Design a protein around this ligand. Structure first.
Ligand SMILES: *[C@@H]1O[C@H](CO)[C@@H](O[C@@H]2O[C@H](CO)[C@@H](O)[C@H](O)[C@H]2NC(C)=O)[C@H](O)[C@H]1NC(C)=O
Ligand SMILES: *[C@@H]1O[C@H](CO)[C@@H](O[C@@H]2O[C@H](CO)[C@@H](O)[C@H](O)[C@H]2NC(C)=O)[C@H](O)[C@H]1NC(C)=O
Ligand SMILES: *[C@@H]1O[C@H](CO)[C@@H](O[C@@H]2O[C@H](CO)[C@@H](O)[C@H](O)[C@H]2NC(C)=O)[C@H](O)[C@H]1NC(C)=O
Ligand SMILES: *[C@@H]1O[C@H](CO)[C@@H](O[C@@H]2O[C@H](CO)[C@@H](O)[C@H](O)[C@H]2NC(C)=O)[C@H](O)[C@H]1NC(C)=O
Ligand SMILES: *[C@@H]1O[C@H](CO)[C@@H](O)[C@H](O)[C@H]1NC(C)=O
Ligand SMILES: *[C@@H]1O[C@H](CO)[C@@H](O)[C@H](O)[C@H]1NC(C)=O
Ligand SMILES: *[C@@H]1O[C@H](CO)[C@@H](O)[C@H](O)[C@H]1NC(C)=O
Ligand SMILES: *[C@@H]1O[C@H](CO)[C@@H](O)[C@H](O)[C@H]1NC(C)=O
Ligand SMILES: *[C@@H]1O[C@H](CO)[C@@H](O)[C@H](O)[C@H]1NC(C)=O
Ligand SMILES: *[C@@H]1O[C@H](CO)[C@@H](O)[C@H](O)[C@H]1NC(C)=O
Ligand SMILES: *[C@@H]1O[C@H](CO)[C@@H](O)[C@H](O)[C@H]1NC(C)=O
Ligand SMILES: *[C@@H]1O[C@H](CO)[C@@H](O)[C@H](O)[C@H]1NC(C)=O
Lengths: 378, 265, 219, 49, 50
């Protein structure tokens, strides 16, 4: 990896940043709030007496928690068509108002409750607009609405005629109860919509979290701060979310950025050896994936720590250097220098008796290369 | 730039080596900061020690010699001076030298001067009594050296009072606070620049991504990328200009340590 | 009469905890040292952009407000009431008395004479401040109850107002009123403008001081 | 950039603190210029005649 | 249509050329100080005794 980073086949001694170490997060915990008013449909879908077809009812469902799944999967409905929107995506959308219309018709008149039909029912009893949005639900109700001798209380406009329902009628002449849900979206600020589940909430693990809208990543930890009892999450200076409140249990939890840091490779040079040591920079050495050694500069793997102190060879940091000495690599604290002890006294002097002539070099750059570019040709 | 997302990384891969250049630029700066300190402080061969007595001709250096009752072993005035001064890919590396090591270099430079005058800066340290070294220095400014020996007590008292006034004048360092302030303030702007759309619908790479489909989202993500890359270039260019100013200052410090501490100017 | 607020009508701009952090905001506030009407005991006022509203007493003469554009039928309006029982928010089309009130036997409520088409219901000395605003079909209400050691004059000091309610109505508003309990056996009105403030946050996360950044050169 | 135009000014707000940075950079080098000539010429305590 | 695609290249290439020209100014200001020190050492160590 070092040879690839440098684009060469011979690396000279040094220390090279080669890549990065990033812990990985597993599972996605989706937190959310409970559900009180889940809407009691069990009044429109559970009535003891429905409404005529020529004077249908009209209930205006309003701000609530609507669960169209208990409807969709109830398997008791003989007809469940959705027009503006396919059924499974109802528990994931929000509108302004839902209206529910209720009535009772024959069995083979359920095909006129649809956008763009004709017939005595859709012509003048109950007409659906041509860009309908809701869903139409219908189920047979022979045992409730049909009575021996004929139930002449269910009329329709044709001016009014009455279905004489009787229990010995072939299907398609037995009474069906119909409910038409119509979702509308005026121009308000919001209203009723599907539900919201909430997985479990762990701690002390890099995780991918969602707190009723707040999407993030990190380790969650028990807090000891105290919000005011209307504040949801806390922010830092420079404006990053660093605390949240759990909606269900209402406790404050800190959000720490998941560990991370550069990876460096320490090599004595390929002309000496092919052994290598690895520094994970400012990462705690317990969360890296022999010699594992913790430094103020990160976690070092592949070098042994000795107690001697030499002159610095390859600089690691915070006073630590490495060398290829003791057929391998090692760590330690660099040496400032020898130790000279001047025999100072209040009446002692040292005077030299000889000298040496020494000559040293000093190298300095004075120029660099003069280059020109031609903007247009480049 | 991207930050976690994966739709961002493939789009940013289209810009070439813009990010490799910036990391090289910042790494050069960080390697230069250790050489600055090596050039100012590691100007001594041996680690010299003062003798256990303190018979220096009436001169008293106790406020600037190291304090043996401390983990850091700093001096009194070095203790006064030290009480007056994770994110989205950002990291702070530690210096190679601890400041225990720096205090240990400075105390050795001090013991070299108090015990050998200027001889340890040109070769091996040759001891000389402190009053006689003070008399050599009076010759260097053109005063005759009996003026020192006949006024030794007065001269030592004046030194001692002037050293005492420095702590009171201390317990100034705005030149050291400015560097810290300018750097922290330039690092705060880079983080604040991440909540700007730069003319996209939003400034958070998920909400753009979970409210549009790819052909539509790539357009906004490229605007976000362009803004965030411009911010990082501004940051790195200013760090390059600000490090060349710190280097010219450490060069002046090295010359002062050579010429005012290891000799008489 | 008219009077001078000093530093009044500061509310928490939103959730999100916070501590010692001179945080800067742009929002609709009541400017410092403003010209607030004085009323004694009342008439139809405007709304036009939010409202500050304080009141002082030991009895309870101030018994809620009524809002809207026409304060009658043919268009919808809000109604917020409090008998000796508890608060009653309500949103219908009404027919409001041009001088609506409630008595104090203790029989009352000559307020309206119509409650049609209701689209929202709800049922269940002293200084009582309120901030009313109406944005994107939501009608927000902040409030605070401080105890004065006077009876009925506007005091001086700092006290931030905490959010109370949120109503997704959709209603248009251009006018509002007040409701009082008659005799049978003092209040102010500020307005809000888009200002920029600097709020000082405590270590518990409460706003303890503020700076209005358009008062004078020092600010 | 905009020159007395509110349509342009609100669009310029979508780039953040670029203009604050630019003014801060230009002001710091105007302060340095007075320091430059104080350091060369005011090297004397009294005005000698 | 090719205008929109040529402009994307023009912007990138201009950015890259201008980055090259900034980093050369910053590197030349450093070579200049080294040559200024070399000129002082030639005066003070070669034509004199320091
Ligand atoms: C109307 O109410 C009845 C009774 O509460 C509900 O019938 C239940 O349906 C579930 C699922 O089919 C059965 O497991 C229960 O046994 C039924 N109840 C009883 C008492 O046996 C019905 O679901 C309600 N209708 C709607 C639309 O919610
Ligand atoms: C949301 O619902 C859960 C249960 O579904 C509530 O958990 C209860 O919390 C109380 C603590 O006051 C415990 O005594 C109960 O035993 C818990 N119930 C269960 C089933 O664990 C939770 O309190 C609800 N959220 C809020 C905000 O009240
Ligand atoms: C001063 O030092 C020089 C060495 O630099 C001494 O000269 C050396 O003497 C030894 C022994 O006589 C010879 O082996 C070397 O060849 C000499 N070196 C050179 C360069 O000629 C010299 O003797 C010393 N003087 C005193 C007085 O000690
Ligand atoms: C060197 O000077 C220090 C003063 O900075 C002397 O220490 C103080 O001495 C006085 C009395 O002379 C005491 O009252 C103080 O409490 C001392 N301060 C300390 C010990 O921190 C010190 O004695 C002088 N050295 C010598 C050898 O006289
Ligand atoms: C590099 O290799 C050459 C020949 O293999 C050898 O002479 C030289 O000593 C090597 N350098 C080091 C530093 O080992
Ligand atoms: C790494 O984590 C362990 C477990 O909490 C802790 O004991 C250790 O101190 C951490 N590393 C450092 C350098 O503090
Ligand atoms: C280094 O010396 C210390 C002395 O405190 C000792 O505890 C430690 O075991 C030594 N390390 C090794 C590797 O021998
Ligand atoms: C408030 O405005 C009215 C408008 O005429 C003015 O008469 C009054 O003096 C003002 N009050 C204050 C305190 O400025
Ligand atoms: C208080 O007023 C509301 C307004 O409708 C009413 O519903 C409630 O019944 C009243 N309280 C009592 C005790 O009647
Ligand atoms: C509102 O009330 C009026 C009169 O009671 C009525 O004509 C109108 O239909 C109602 N609004 C709706 C949406 O039904
Ligand atoms: C409020 O009144 C204005 C009058 O200009 C009107 O245009 C607007 O549609 C009304 N609000 C709603 C939500 O209809
Ligand atoms: C609230 O703040 C006060 C003073 O700032 C502090 O003493 C107290 O501990 C905090 N927390 C409380 C009262 O719960």
């Amino acid at each position: 990896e070092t040879k690839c980073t440098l684009k060469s086949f011979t690396v000279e001694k040094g220390i090279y940043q080669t890549s990065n170490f990033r812990v990985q997060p597993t599972e996605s915990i989706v937190r959310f709030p409970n559900i009180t008013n889940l809407c009691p449909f069990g009044e429109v879908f559970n009535a003891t007496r429905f409404a005529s077809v020529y004077a249908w009812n009209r209930k205006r469902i309003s701000n609530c928690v609507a669960d169209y799944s208990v409807l969709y999967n109830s398997a008791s409905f003989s007809t469940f068509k959705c027009y503006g929107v396919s059924p499974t995506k109802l528990n994931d959308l929000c509108f302004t108002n839902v209206y529910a219309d209720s009535f009772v018709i024959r069995g083979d008149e359920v095909r006129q409750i649809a956008p763009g039909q004709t017939g005595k029912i859709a012509d003048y009893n109950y007409k659906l607009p041509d860009d309908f949005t809701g869903c139409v639900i219908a189920w047979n109700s022979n045992n409730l609405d049909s009575k021996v001798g004929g139930n002449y209380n269910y009329l329709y406009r044709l001016p009014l005629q009455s279905y004489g329902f009787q229990p010995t009628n072939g299907v398609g002449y037995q009474p069906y109860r119909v409910v038409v849900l119509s979702f509308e979206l005026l121009h308000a600020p919001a209203t009723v919509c599907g539900p919201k589940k909430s997985t479990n909430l762990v701690k002390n693990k890099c995780v991918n979290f969602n707190f009723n809208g707040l999407t993030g990543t990190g380790v969650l930890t028990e807090s000891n701060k105290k919000f005011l009892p209307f504040q949801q999450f806390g922010r830092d200076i420079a404006d990053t979310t660093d605390a949240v409140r759990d909606p269900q249990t209402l406790e404050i939890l800190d959000i720490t950025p998941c560990s991370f840091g550069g990876v460096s490779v320490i090599t004595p040079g390929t002309n000496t050896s092919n052994q290598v040591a690895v520094l994970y920079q400012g990462v705690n050495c317990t969360e890296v994936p022999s010699n594992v050694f913790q430094t103020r500069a990160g976690c070092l793997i592949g070098a042994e720590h000795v107690n001697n102190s030499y002159e610095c060879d390859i600089p690691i940091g915070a006073g630590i250097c490495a060398s290829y000495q003791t057929q391998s690599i090692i760590a330690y604290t660099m040496s400032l220098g020898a130790e000279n002890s001047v025999a100072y006294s209040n009446n002692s002097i040292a005077i030299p008796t000889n000298f040496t002539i020494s000559v040293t070099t000093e190298i300095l750059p004075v120029s660099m290369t003069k280059t020109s570019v031609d903007c247009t040709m480049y | 730039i991207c930050g976690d997302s994966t739709e961002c990384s493939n789009l940013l891969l289209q810009y070439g080596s813009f990010c490799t250049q910036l990391n090289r630029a910042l790494t050069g700066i960080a390697v230069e900061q250790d050489k600055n300190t090596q050039e100012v402080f590691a100007q001594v061969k041996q680690i010299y020690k003062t003798p256990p007595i303190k018979d220096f001709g009436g001169f008293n250096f106790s406020q600037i010699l190291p304090d043996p009752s401390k983990p850091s072993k700093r001096s009194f005035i070095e203790d006064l001076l030290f009480n007056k001064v994770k994110f989205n890919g950002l990291t702070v590396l530690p210096p190679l030298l601890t400041d225990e090591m720096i205090a240990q270099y400075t105390s050795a430079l001090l013991a070299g001067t108090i015990t050998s005058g200027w001889t340890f800066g040109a070769g091996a340290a040759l001891q000389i009594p402190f009053a006689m070294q003070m008399a050599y220095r009076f010759n260097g400014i053109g005063v005759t050296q009996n003026v020192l020996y006949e006024n030794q007590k007065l001269i030592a008292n004046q030194f001692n009072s002037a050293i005492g006034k420095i702590q009171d004048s201390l317990s100034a360092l705005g030149k050291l606070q400015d560097v810290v302030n300018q750097n922290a303030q330039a690092l705060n702007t880079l983080v604040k620049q991440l909540s700007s759309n730069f003319g996209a619908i939003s400034s958070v790479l998920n909400d753009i991504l979970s409210r549009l489909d790819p052909p539509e989202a790539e357009v906004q993500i490229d605007r976000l990328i362009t803004g965030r890359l411009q911010s990082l270039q501004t940051y790195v260019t200013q760090q390059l200009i600000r490090a060349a100013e710190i280097r010219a200052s450490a060069n002046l410090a090295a010359t002062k340590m050579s010429e005012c501490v290891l000799g008489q100017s | 009469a008219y009077t001078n607020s000093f530093t009044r009508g500061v509310y928490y701009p939103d959730k999100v905890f916070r501590s010692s952090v001179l945080h800067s905001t742009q929002d609709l506030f009541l400017p410092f040292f403003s010209n607030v009407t004085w009323f004694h005991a009342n008439p139809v006022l405007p709304f036009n952009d939010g409202v500050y509203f304080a009141s002082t007493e030991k009895s309870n003469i101030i018994r809620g407000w009524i809002f809207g554009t026409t304060l009658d039928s043919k268009t919808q309006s809000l109604l917020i009431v409090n008998n000796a029982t508890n608060v009653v928010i309500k949103v219908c089309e009404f027919q409001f008395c041009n001088d609506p009130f409630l008595g104090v036997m203790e029989s009352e409520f000559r307020v309206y004479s119509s409650a049609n088409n209701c689209t929202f219901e709800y049922v269940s000395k002293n200084l009582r401040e309120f901030v009313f605003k109406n944005i994107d079909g939501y009608f927000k209400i902040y409030s605070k109850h401080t105890p004065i050691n006077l009876v009925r004059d506007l005091p001086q000091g700092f006290s931030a107002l905490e959010p109370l309610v949120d109503l997704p109505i959709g209603i248009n508003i251009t006018r509002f009123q007040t409701l009082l309990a008659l005799h049978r056996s003092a209040y102010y009105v500020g307005y809000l403008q888009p200002r920029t403030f600097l709020l000082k946050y405590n270590e518990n996360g409460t706003i303890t001081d503020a700076v209005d950044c358009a008062l004078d050169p020092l600010s």
